[PDB]
Amino acid sequence: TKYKIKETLKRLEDSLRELRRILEELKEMLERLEKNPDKDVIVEVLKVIVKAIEASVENQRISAENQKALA
Amino acid sequence: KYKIKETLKRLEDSLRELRRILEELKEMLERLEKNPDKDVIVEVLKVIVKAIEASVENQRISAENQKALA
Amino acid sequence: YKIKETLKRLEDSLRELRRILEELKEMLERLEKNPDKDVIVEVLKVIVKAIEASVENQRISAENQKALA
């Protein structure tokens, strides 16, 4: 079960890097919203939020995988 | 350890619910792209908070289970 | 001790997350009252902090899993 745990941790690490990237983009677009809260900008922000939530669920999947292995 | 197995099963069910909400969320996302107007935006925000609430609940169950593995 | 301390960090991070969620939950009810423009923006900003809080909790959770391994 050694390969399993460490392989999932590496994927979990990559998944986390992806989350931080999307969050960076989410904070960049949030500053646009401030300068001028248009309605098309709001649309774009919503899309990235769903991407973040997608990435988040994906991370939690890998986490659950690792918890199975640990048990 | 019975609790661990039980929590994993619970953690598993929470995940399935997340994907269901995620699909729902992904549907409505291409329903404001057709009608970029107000209160359809509100419909999505409702589902986003729902997704997040489900996400936090999933993380609560997850940490609870990690306290057990220790 | 890693495990014990990481688990404590996880507890605090989770608390932080649940708190922001309570705020987000209230902001949503305010939106069911009067959808506005400033109101909507106010909800998006809270949603981002929640995601930030969630990513932070997931990072701390991963470290707790590292220790367990």
Side-chain angles (χ1 to χ4, degrees), chain A residues 5 9 12 16 19 23 26-27 30 33 37 42 45-46 49 52 56 59-60 63 66-67 70, chain C residues 37-38 40-41 44-45 47-49 51-55 58-59 61-62 64-66 68-69:
Chain A
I5 291 176
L9 286 169
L12 191 65
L16 285 161
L19 278 172
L23 185 53
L26 181 51
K27 268 159 174 293
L30 199 66
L33 206 84
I42 288 170
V45 171
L46 289 171
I49 287 167
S56 176
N59 184 87
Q60 291 182 83
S63 179
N66 193 77
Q67 284 177 72
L70 287 168
Chain C
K37 228 166 309 159
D38 256 330
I40 297 169
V41 176
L44 293 177
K45 254 123 104 63
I47 287 166
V48 171
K49 302 301 167 300
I51 292 174
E52 178 168 358
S54 181
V55 173
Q58 286 178 90
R59 187 185 66 80
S61 175
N64 183 75
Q65 280 183 0
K66 266 195 73 226
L68 287 168

mmCIF file of all heavy atoms in Angstrom, chain A residues 5 9 12 16 19 23 26-27 30 33 37 42 45-46 49 52 56 59-60 63 66-67 70, chain C residues 37-38 40-41 44-45 47-49 51-55 58-59 61-62 64-66 68-69:
data_model
loop_
_atom_site.group_PDB
_atom_site.id
_atom_site.type_symbol
_atom_site.label_atom_id
_atom_site.label_comp_id
_atom_site.label_asym_id
_atom_site.label_seq_id
_atom_site.Cartn_x
_atom_site.Cartn_y
_atom_site.Cartn_z
ATOM 1 N N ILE A 5 -0.413 5.128 -1.470
ATOM 2 C CA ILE A 5 -0.435 6.341 -0.658
ATOM 3 C C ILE A 5 0.402 7.458 -1.276
ATOM 4 O O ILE A 5 -0.070 8.585 -1.421
ATOM 5 C CB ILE A 5 0.064 6.056 0.777
ATOM 6 C CG1 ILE A 5 -0.957 5.177 1.505
ATOM 7 C CG2 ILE A 5 0.301 7.358 1.546
ATOM 8 C CD1 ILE A 5 -0.541 4.736 2.892
ATOM 9 N N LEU A 9 -0.746 11.028 -2.961
ATOM 10 C CA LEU A 9 -0.239 12.274 -2.395
ATOM 11 C C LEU A 9 0.330 13.177 -3.486
ATOM 12 O O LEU A 9 0.172 14.395 -3.433
ATOM 13 C CB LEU A 9 0.832 11.997 -1.339
ATOM 14 C CG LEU A 9 0.349 11.467 0.013
ATOM 15 C CD1 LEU A 9 1.530 10.988 0.838
ATOM 16 C CD2 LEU A 9 -0.436 12.524 0.771
ATOM 17 N N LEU A 12 -2.557 14.508 -5.289
ATOM 18 C CA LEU A 12 -3.202 15.452 -4.391
ATOM 19 C C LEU A 12 -2.432 16.770 -4.416
ATOM 20 O O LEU A 12 -3.023 17.849 -4.402
ATOM 21 C CB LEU A 12 -3.270 14.877 -2.972
ATOM 22 C CG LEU A 12 -4.135 15.607 -1.943
ATOM 23 C CD1 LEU A 12 -5.602 15.549 -2.330
ATOM 24 C CD2 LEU A 12 -3.922 15.018 -0.553
ATOM 25 N N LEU A 16 -3.760 20.353 -5.765
ATOM 26 C CA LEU A 16 -3.702 21.556 -4.948
ATOM 27 C C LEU A 16 -3.072 22.705 -5.723
ATOM 28 O O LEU A 16 -3.518 23.847 -5.615
ATOM 29 C CB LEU A 16 -2.927 21.295 -3.658
ATOM 30 C CG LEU A 16 -3.704 20.488 -2.618
ATOM 31 C CD1 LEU A 16 -2.757 19.876 -1.602
ATOM 32 C CD2 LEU A 16 -4.729 21.369 -1.926
ATOM 33 N N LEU A 19 -5.676 24.190 -7.865
ATOM 34 C CA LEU A 19 -6.601 25.019 -7.100
ATOM 35 C C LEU A 19 -6.035 26.415 -6.862
ATOM 36 O O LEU A 19 -6.746 27.409 -7.002
ATOM 37 C CB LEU A 19 -6.928 24.362 -5.755
ATOM 38 C CG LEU A 19 -8.001 23.274 -5.764
ATOM 39 C CD1 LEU A 19 -8.058 22.596 -4.409
ATOM 40 C CD2 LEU A 19 -9.356 23.862 -6.123
ATOM 41 N N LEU A 23 -7.534 29.960 -8.193
ATOM 42 C CA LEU A 23 -7.861 30.950 -7.181
ATOM 43 C C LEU A 23 -7.158 32.265 -7.499
ATOM 44 O O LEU A 23 -7.712 33.341 -7.277
ATOM 45 C CB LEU A 23 -7.473 30.449 -5.790
ATOM 46 C CG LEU A 23 -7.857 31.325 -4.595
ATOM 47 C CD1 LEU A 23 -9.341 31.666 -4.596
ATOM 48 C CD2 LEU A 23 -7.487 30.613 -3.305
ATOM 49 N N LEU A 26 -9.147 33.787 -10.033
ATOM 50 C CA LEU A 26 -10.411 34.222 -9.461
ATOM 51 C C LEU A 26 -10.243 35.560 -8.753
ATOM 52 O O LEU A 26 -11.165 36.372 -8.722
ATOM 53 C CB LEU A 26 -10.948 33.166 -8.495
ATOM 54 C CG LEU A 26 -12.294 33.440 -7.822
ATOM 55 C CD1 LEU A 26 -13.363 33.821 -8.838
ATOM 56 C CD2 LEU A 26 -12.722 32.210 -7.032
ATOM 57 N N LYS A 27 -9.058 35.792 -8.197
ATOM 58 C CA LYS A 27 -8.778 37.035 -7.489
ATOM 59 C C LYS A 27 -8.385 38.150 -8.450
ATOM 60 O O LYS A 27 -8.563 39.329 -8.148
ATOM 61 C CB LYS A 27 -7.675 36.819 -6.454
ATOM 62 C CG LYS A 27 -8.203 36.462 -5.078
ATOM 63 C CD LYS A 27 -7.147 35.767 -4.246
ATOM 64 C CE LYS A 27 -7.631 35.538 -2.830
ATOM 65 N NZ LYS A 27 -7.799 36.816 -2.084
ATOM 66 N N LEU A 30 -11.686 39.317 -9.805
ATOM 67 C CA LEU A 30 -12.456 39.967 -8.757
ATOM 68 C C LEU A 30 -12.115 41.452 -8.703
ATOM 69 O O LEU A 30 -12.962 42.282 -8.375
ATOM 70 C CB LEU A 30 -12.183 39.303 -7.408
ATOM 71 C CG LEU A 30 -13.206 39.547 -6.300
ATOM 72 C CD1 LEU A 30 -14.548 38.912 -6.644
ATOM 73 C CD2 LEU A 30 -12.676 39.008 -4.984
ATOM 74 N N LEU A 33 -14.041 43.279 -11.318
ATOM 75 C CA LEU A 33 -15.401 43.489 -10.848
ATOM 76 C C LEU A 33 -15.519 44.780 -10.043
ATOM 77 O O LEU A 33 -16.528 45.482 -10.117
ATOM 78 C CB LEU A 33 -15.841 42.301 -9.995
ATOM 79 C CG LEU A 33 -17.341 42.033 -9.919
ATOM 80 C CD1 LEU A 33 -17.800 41.211 -11.113
ATOM 81 C CD2 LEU A 33 -17.670 41.323 -8.624
ATOM 82 N N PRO A 37 -18.298 46.913 -11.990
ATOM 83 C CA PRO A 37 -19.084 45.680 -11.919
ATOM 84 C C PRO A 37 -20.069 45.553 -13.078
ATOM 85 O O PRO A 37 -21.263 45.794 -12.904
ATOM 86 C CB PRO A 37 -19.812 45.812 -10.578
ATOM 87 C CG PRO A 37 -19.981 47.276 -10.402
ATOM 88 C CD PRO A 37 -18.750 47.909 -11.002
ATOM 89 N N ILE A 42 -19.364 39.646 -14.335
ATOM 90 C CA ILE A 42 -20.012 38.782 -13.352
ATOM 91 C C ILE A 42 -20.187 37.373 -13.910
ATOM 92 O O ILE A 42 -19.963 36.390 -13.207
ATOM 93 C CB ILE A 42 -21.384 39.345 -12.926
ATOM 94 C CG1 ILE A 42 -21.188 40.585 -12.055
ATOM 95 C CG2 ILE A 42 -22.190 38.303 -12.158
ATOM 96 C CD1 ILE A 42 -22.459 41.361 -11.788
ATOM 97 N N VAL A 45 -16.791 35.655 -13.902
ATOM 98 C CA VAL A 45 -16.440 35.311 -12.528
ATOM 99 C C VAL A 45 -17.173 34.052 -12.083
ATOM 100 O O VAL A 45 -16.596 33.196 -11.419
ATOM 101 C CB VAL A 45 -16.762 36.465 -11.554
ATOM 102 C CG1 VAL A 45 -16.600 36.019 -10.104
ATOM 103 C CG2 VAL A 45 -15.871 37.656 -11.841
ATOM 104 N N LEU A 46 -18.443 33.938 -12.458
ATOM 105 C CA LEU A 46 -19.230 32.767 -12.096
ATOM 106 C C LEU A 46 -18.646 31.508 -12.727
ATOM 107 O O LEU A 46 -18.622 30.452 -12.102
ATOM 108 C CB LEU A 46 -20.692 32.942 -12.518
ATOM 109 C CG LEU A 46 -21.514 33.958 -11.715
ATOM 110 C CD1 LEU A 46 -22.866 34.182 -12.371
ATOM 111 C CD2 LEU A 46 -21.692 33.516 -10.268
ATOM 112 N N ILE A 49 -15.605 30.411 -10.853
ATOM 113 C CA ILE A 49 -16.025 29.873 -9.562
ATOM 114 C C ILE A 49 -16.426 28.408 -9.717
ATOM 115 O O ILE A 49 -16.088 27.576 -8.874
ATOM 116 C CB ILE A 49 -17.188 30.688 -8.955
ATOM 117 C CG1 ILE A 49 -16.663 32.034 -8.460
ATOM 118 C CG2 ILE A 49 -17.836 29.942 -7.790
ATOM 119 C CD1 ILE A 49 -17.739 33.034 -8.124
ATOM 120 N N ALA A 52 -13.364 26.441 -10.099
ATOM 121 C CA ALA A 52 -12.738 26.279 -8.792
ATOM 122 C C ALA A 52 -13.431 25.171 -8.008
ATOM 123 O O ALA A 52 -12.774 24.323 -7.412
ATOM 124 C CB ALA A 52 -12.778 27.582 -8.014
ATOM 125 N N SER A 56 -12.056 21.753 -6.764
ATOM 126 C CA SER A 56 -12.152 21.452 -5.344
ATOM 127 C C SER A 56 -12.716 20.056 -5.126
ATOM 128 O O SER A 56 -12.197 19.295 -4.313
ATOM 129 C CB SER A 56 -13.022 22.483 -4.627
ATOM 130 O OG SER A 56 -13.177 22.130 -3.262
ATOM 131 N N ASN A 59 -10.126 17.498 -6.000
ATOM 132 C CA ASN A 59 -9.186 17.359 -4.914
ATOM 133 C C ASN A 59 -9.740 16.517 -3.783
ATOM 134 O O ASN A 59 -9.081 15.709 -3.240
ATOM 135 C CB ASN A 59 -8.727 18.710 -4.404
ATOM 136 C CG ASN A 59 -7.659 18.619 -3.329
ATOM 137 O OD1 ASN A 59 -6.492 18.551 -3.608
ATOM 138 N ND2 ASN A 59 -8.077 18.627 -2.107
ATOM 139 N N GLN A 60 -10.974 16.726 -3.439
ATOM 140 C CA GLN A 60 -11.575 15.981 -2.344
ATOM 141 C C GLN A 60 -11.731 14.507 -2.710
ATOM 142 O O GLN A 60 -11.714 13.645 -1.835
ATOM 143 C CB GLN A 60 -12.922 16.595 -1.962
ATOM 144 C CG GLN A 60 -12.770 17.965 -1.317
ATOM 145 C CD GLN A 60 -14.089 18.575 -0.888
ATOM 146 O OE1 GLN A 60 -14.599 18.277 0.188
ATOM 147 N NE2 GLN A 60 -14.642 19.442 -1.729
ATOM 148 N N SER A 63 -8.391 13.012 -2.090
ATOM 149 C CA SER A 63 -8.225 12.963 -0.640
ATOM 150 C C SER A 63 -8.920 11.740 -0.046
ATOM 151 O O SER A 63 -8.340 11.023 0.772
ATOM 152 C CB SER A 63 -8.771 14.237 0.006
ATOM 153 O OG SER A 63 -8.640 14.191 1.415
ATOM 154 N N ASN A 66 -7.003 8.673 -0.656
ATOM 155 C CA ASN A 66 -5.860 8.541 0.213
ATOM 156 C C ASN A 66 -6.286 8.105 1.594
ATOM 157 O O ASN A 66 -5.587 7.447 2.274
ATOM 158 C CB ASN A 66 -5.077 9.843 0.266
ATOM 159 C CG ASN A 66 -3.713 9.706 0.881
ATOM 160 O OD1 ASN A 66 -2.800 9.223 0.279
ATOM 161 N ND2 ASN A 66 -3.569 10.193 2.074
ATOM 162 N N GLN A 67 -7.470 8.470 1.988
ATOM 163 C CA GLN A 67 -7.981 8.065 3.293
ATOM 164 C C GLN A 67 -8.342 6.586 3.320
ATOM 165 O O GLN A 67 -8.217 5.938 4.358
ATOM 166 C CB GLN A 67 -9.195 8.904 3.681
ATOM 167 C CG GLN A 67 -8.837 10.301 4.129
ATOM 168 C CD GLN A 67 -10.056 11.135 4.432
ATOM 169 O OE1 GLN A 67 -10.740 10.921 5.433
ATOM 170 N NE2 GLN A 67 -10.347 12.090 3.557
ATOM 171 N N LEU A 70 -4.985 4.820 3.708
ATOM 172 C CA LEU A 70 -4.470 4.993 5.058
ATOM 173 C C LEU A 70 -5.189 4.076 6.050
ATOM 174 O O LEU A 70 -4.614 3.679 7.063
ATOM 175 C CB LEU A 70 -4.600 6.457 5.494
ATOM 176 C CG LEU A 70 -3.626 7.449 4.847
ATOM 177 C CD1 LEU A 70 -4.052 8.878 5.131
ATOM 178 C CD2 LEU A 70 -2.200 7.222 5.329
ATOM 179 N N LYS C 37 -27.048 45.262 -7.540
ATOM 180 C CA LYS C 37 -25.789 45.175 -8.245
ATOM 181 C C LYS C 37 -24.739 45.122 -7.198
ATOM 182 O O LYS C 37 -23.877 44.269 -7.216
ATOM 183 C CB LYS C 37 -25.577 46.387 -9.123
ATOM 184 C CG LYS C 37 -25.137 46.061 -10.530
ATOM 185 C CD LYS C 37 -25.265 47.274 -11.428
ATOM 186 C CE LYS C 37 -26.646 47.936 -11.338
ATOM 187 N NZ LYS C 37 -26.671 49.359 -11.799
ATOM 188 N N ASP C 38 -24.808 46.053 -6.270
ATOM 189 C CA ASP C 38 -23.809 45.994 -5.210
ATOM 190 C C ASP C 38 -23.996 44.740 -4.363
ATOM 191 O O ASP C 38 -23.030 44.177 -3.849
ATOM 192 C CB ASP C 38 -23.895 47.238 -4.324
ATOM 193 C CG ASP C 38 -22.776 48.224 -4.595
ATOM 194 O OD1 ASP C 38 -21.676 47.785 -4.991
ATOM 195 O OD2 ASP C 38 -22.995 49.440 -4.411
ATOM 196 N N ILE C 40 -25.108 41.695 -5.348
ATOM 197 C CA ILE C 40 -24.537 40.553 -6.052
ATOM 198 C C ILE C 40 -23.023 40.516 -5.881
ATOM 199 O O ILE C 40 -22.450 39.475 -5.561
ATOM 200 C CB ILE C 40 -24.868 40.600 -7.554
ATOM 201 C CG1 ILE C 40 -26.379 40.501 -7.770
ATOM 202 C CG2 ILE C 40 -24.152 39.478 -8.290
ATOM 203 C CD1 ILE C 40 -26.812 40.806 -9.187
ATOM 204 N N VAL C 41 -22.381 41.660 -6.094
ATOM 205 C CA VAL C 41 -20.933 41.761 -5.961
ATOM 206 C C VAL C 41 -20.494 41.382 -4.551
ATOM 207 O O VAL C 41 -19.438 40.779 -4.360
ATOM 208 C CB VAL C 41 -20.440 43.186 -6.269
ATOM 209 C CG1 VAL C 41 -18.942 43.294 -6.027
ATOM 210 C CG2 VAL C 41 -20.785 43.571 -7.700
ATOM 211 N N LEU C 44 -20.386 37.556 -4.328
ATOM 212 C CA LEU C 44 -19.256 36.988 -5.055
ATOM 213 C C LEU C 44 -17.971 37.111 -4.244
ATOM 214 O O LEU C 44 -17.152 36.194 -4.221
ATOM 215 C CB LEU C 44 -19.080 37.670 -6.414
ATOM 216 C CG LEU C 44 -20.181 37.442 -7.453
ATOM 217 C CD1 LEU C 44 -19.893 38.252 -8.706
ATOM 218 C CD2 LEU C 44 -20.322 35.965 -7.791
ATOM 219 N N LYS C 45 -17.803 38.247 -3.575
ATOM 220 C CA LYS C 45 -16.607 38.484 -2.775
ATOM 221 C C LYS C 45 -16.523 37.511 -1.605
ATOM 222 O O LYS C 45 -15.444 37.034 -1.276
ATOM 223 C CB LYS C 45 -16.575 39.930 -2.264
ATOM 224 C CG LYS C 45 -15.559 40.819 -2.990
ATOM 225 C CD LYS C 45 -16.192 42.056 -3.628
ATOM 226 C CE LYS C 45 -15.913 43.312 -2.814
ATOM 227 N NZ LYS C 45 -14.454 43.617 -2.743
ATOM 228 N N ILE C 47 -17.959 34.554 -1.585
ATOM 229 C CA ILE C 47 -17.769 33.239 -2.195
ATOM 230 C C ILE C 47 -16.286 32.973 -2.448
ATOM 231 O O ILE C 47 -15.816 31.852 -2.272
ATOM 232 C CB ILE C 47 -18.563 33.107 -3.520
ATOM 233 C CG1 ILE C 47 -20.059 32.985 -3.217
ATOM 234 C CG2 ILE C 47 -18.107 31.886 -4.322
ATOM 235 C CD1 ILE C 47 -20.961 33.194 -4.420
ATOM 236 N N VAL C 48 -15.550 34.006 -2.846
ATOM 237 C CA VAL C 48 -14.124 33.863 -3.119
ATOM 238 C C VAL C 48 -13.339 33.603 -1.838
ATOM 239 O O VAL C 48 -12.409 32.798 -1.830
ATOM 240 C CB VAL C 48 -13.556 35.111 -3.823
ATOM 241 C CG1 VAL C 48 -12.034 35.052 -3.896
ATOM 242 C CG2 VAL C 48 -14.143 35.231 -5.213
ATOM 243 N N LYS C 49 -13.712 34.281 -0.756
ATOM 244 C CA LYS C 49 -13.061 34.060 0.529
ATOM 245 C C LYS C 49 -13.340 32.655 1.036
ATOM 246 O O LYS C 49 -12.490 32.046 1.680
ATOM 247 C CB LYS C 49 -13.525 35.087 1.563
ATOM 248 C CG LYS C 49 -13.277 36.536 1.171
ATOM 249 C CD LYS C 49 -11.804 36.827 0.916
ATOM 250 C CE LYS C 49 -11.601 38.162 0.233
ATOM 251 N NZ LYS C 49 -12.285 38.221 -1.083
ATOM 252 N N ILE C 51 -13.861 30.010 -0.912
ATOM 253 C CA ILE C 51 -13.022 29.146 -1.730
ATOM 254 C C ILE C 51 -11.579 29.224 -1.251
ATOM 255 O O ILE C 51 -10.907 28.204 -1.120
ATOM 256 C CB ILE C 51 -13.106 29.517 -3.224
ATOM 257 C CG1 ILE C 51 -14.498 29.179 -3.758
ATOM 258 C CG2 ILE C 51 -12.048 28.768 -4.032
ATOM 259 C CD1 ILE C 51 -14.743 29.636 -5.182
ATOM 260 N N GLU C 52 -11.103 30.436 -0.985
ATOM 261 C CA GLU C 52 -9.761 30.606 -0.442
ATOM 262 C C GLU C 52 -9.617 29.819 0.858
ATOM 263 O O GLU C 52 -8.639 29.097 1.054
ATOM 264 C CB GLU C 52 -9.454 32.087 -0.205
ATOM 265 C CG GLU C 52 -8.084 32.333 0.406
ATOM 266 C CD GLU C 52 -7.668 33.792 0.364
ATOM 267 O OE1 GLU C 52 -8.430 34.612 -0.184
ATOM 268 O OE2 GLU C 52 -6.595 34.122 0.913
ATOM 269 N N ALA C 53 -10.609 29.950 1.733
ATOM 270 C CA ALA C 53 -10.608 29.238 3.002
ATOM 271 C C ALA C 53 -10.628 27.727 2.782
ATOM 272 O O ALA C 53 -9.994 26.980 3.520
ATOM 273 C CB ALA C 53 -11.795 29.664 3.845
ATOM 274 N N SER C 54 -11.351 27.287 1.756
ATOM 275 C CA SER C 54 -11.490 25.863 1.460
ATOM 276 C C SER C 54 -10.199 25.270 0.907
ATOM 277 O O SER C 54 -9.807 24.165 1.280
ATOM 278 C CB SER C 54 -12.628 25.635 0.467
ATOM 279 O OG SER C 54 -12.787 24.257 0.189
ATOM 280 N N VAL C 55 -9.544 26.003 0.013
ATOM 281 C CA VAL C 55 -8.259 25.576 -0.529
ATOM 282 C C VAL C 55 -7.218 25.495 0.589
ATOM 283 O O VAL C 55 -6.378 24.593 0.605
ATOM 284 C CB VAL C 55 -7.769 26.535 -1.634
ATOM 285 C CG1 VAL C 55 -6.349 26.189 -2.076
ATOM 286 C CG2 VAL C 55 -8.716 26.496 -2.817
ATOM 287 N N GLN C 58 -7.925 22.413 2.600
ATOM 288 C CA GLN C 58 -7.540 21.222 1.858
ATOM 289 C C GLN C 58 -6.024 21.047 1.856
ATOM 290 O O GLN C 58 -5.530 19.924 1.879
ATOM 291 C CB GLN C 58 -8.088 21.286 0.432
ATOM 292 C CG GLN C 58 -9.593 21.031 0.374
ATOM 293 C CD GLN C 58 -10.173 21.126 -1.027
ATOM 294 O OE1 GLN C 58 -10.236 20.135 -1.749
ATOM 295 N NE2 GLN C 58 -10.618 22.319 -1.406
ATOM 296 N N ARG C 59 -5.290 22.156 1.847
ATOM 297 C CA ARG C 59 -3.833 22.103 1.921
ATOM 298 C C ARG C 59 -3.384 21.583 3.284
ATOM 299 O O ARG C 59 -2.465 20.774 3.379
ATOM 300 C CB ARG C 59 -3.220 23.482 1.667
ATOM 301 C CG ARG C 59 -1.697 23.463 1.568
ATOM 302 C CD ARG C 59 -1.107 24.860 1.429
ATOM 303 N NE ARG C 59 -1.323 25.672 2.625
ATOM 304 C CZ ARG C 59 -0.586 25.594 3.730
ATOM 305 N NH1 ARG C 59 0.421 24.734 3.808
ATOM 306 N NH2 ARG C 59 -0.861 26.376 4.766
ATOM 307 N N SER C 61 -5.236 19.775 5.245
ATOM 308 C CA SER C 61 -5.683 18.389 5.320
ATOM 309 C C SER C 61 -4.666 17.458 4.674
ATOM 310 O O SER C 61 -4.421 16.358 5.169
ATOM 311 C CB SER C 61 -7.040 18.212 4.646
ATOM 312 O OG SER C 61 -7.407 16.844 4.628
ATOM 313 N N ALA C 62 -4.076 17.901 3.568
ATOM 314 C CA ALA C 62 -3.097 17.086 2.857
ATOM 315 C C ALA C 62 -1.854 16.892 3.713
ATOM 316 O O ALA C 62 -1.281 15.806 3.746
ATOM 317 C CB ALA C 62 -2.731 17.721 1.532
ATOM 318 N N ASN C 64 -1.825 16.900 6.952
ATOM 319 C CA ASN C 64 -2.247 15.957 7.972
ATOM 320 C C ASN C 64 -2.221 14.521 7.434
ATOM 321 O O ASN C 64 -1.902 13.598 8.127
ATOM 322 C CB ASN C 64 -3.603 16.332 8.551
ATOM 323 C CG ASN C 64 -4.046 15.421 9.674
ATOM 324 O OD1 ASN C 64 -3.557 15.506 10.768
ATOM 325 N ND2 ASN C 64 -4.969 14.568 9.402
ATOM 326 N N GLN C 65 -2.507 14.363 6.169
ATOM 327 C CA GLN C 65 -2.439 13.067 5.560
ATOM 328 C C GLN C 65 -1.008 12.627 5.330
ATOM 329 O O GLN C 65 -0.714 11.484 5.451
ATOM 330 C CB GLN C 65 -3.187 13.028 4.258
ATOM 331 C CG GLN C 65 -4.670 12.870 4.351
ATOM 332 C CD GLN C 65 -5.323 12.766 3.002
ATOM 333 O OE1 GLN C 65 -4.670 12.810 2.007
ATOM 334 N NE2 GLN C 65 -6.587 12.630 2.981
ATOM 335 N N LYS C 66 -0.138 13.549 4.984
ATOM 336 C CA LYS C 66 1.289 13.262 4.874
ATOM 337 C C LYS C 66 1.817 12.663 6.171
ATOM 338 O O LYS C 66 2.519 11.653 6.163
ATOM 339 C CB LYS C 66 2.076 14.529 4.542
ATOM 340 C CG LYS C 66 2.332 14.748 3.062
ATOM 341 C CD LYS C 66 3.403 15.809 2.849
ATOM 342 C CE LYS C 66 4.793 15.287 3.198
ATOM 343 N NZ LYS C 66 5.568 16.254 4.024
ATOM 344 N N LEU C 68 0.105 11.229 8.642
ATOM 345 C CA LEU C 68 -0.516 9.926 8.873
ATOM 346 C C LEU C 68 0.229 8.828 8.128
ATOM 347 O O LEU C 68 0.420 7.731 8.652
ATOM 348 C CB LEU C 68 -1.984 9.942 8.444
ATOM 349 C CG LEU C 68 -2.941 10.722 9.349
ATOM 350 C CD1 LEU C 68 -4.284 10.911 8.664
ATOM 351 C CD2 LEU C 68 -3.115 10.015 10.686
ATOM 352 N N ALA C 69 0.650 9.133 6.906
ATOM 353 C CA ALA C 69 1.409 8.192 6.094
ATOM 354 C C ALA C 69 2.807 7.986 6.673
ATOM 355 O O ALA C 69 3.697 7.466 6.000
ATOM 356 C CB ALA C 69 1.497 8.681 4.658
#
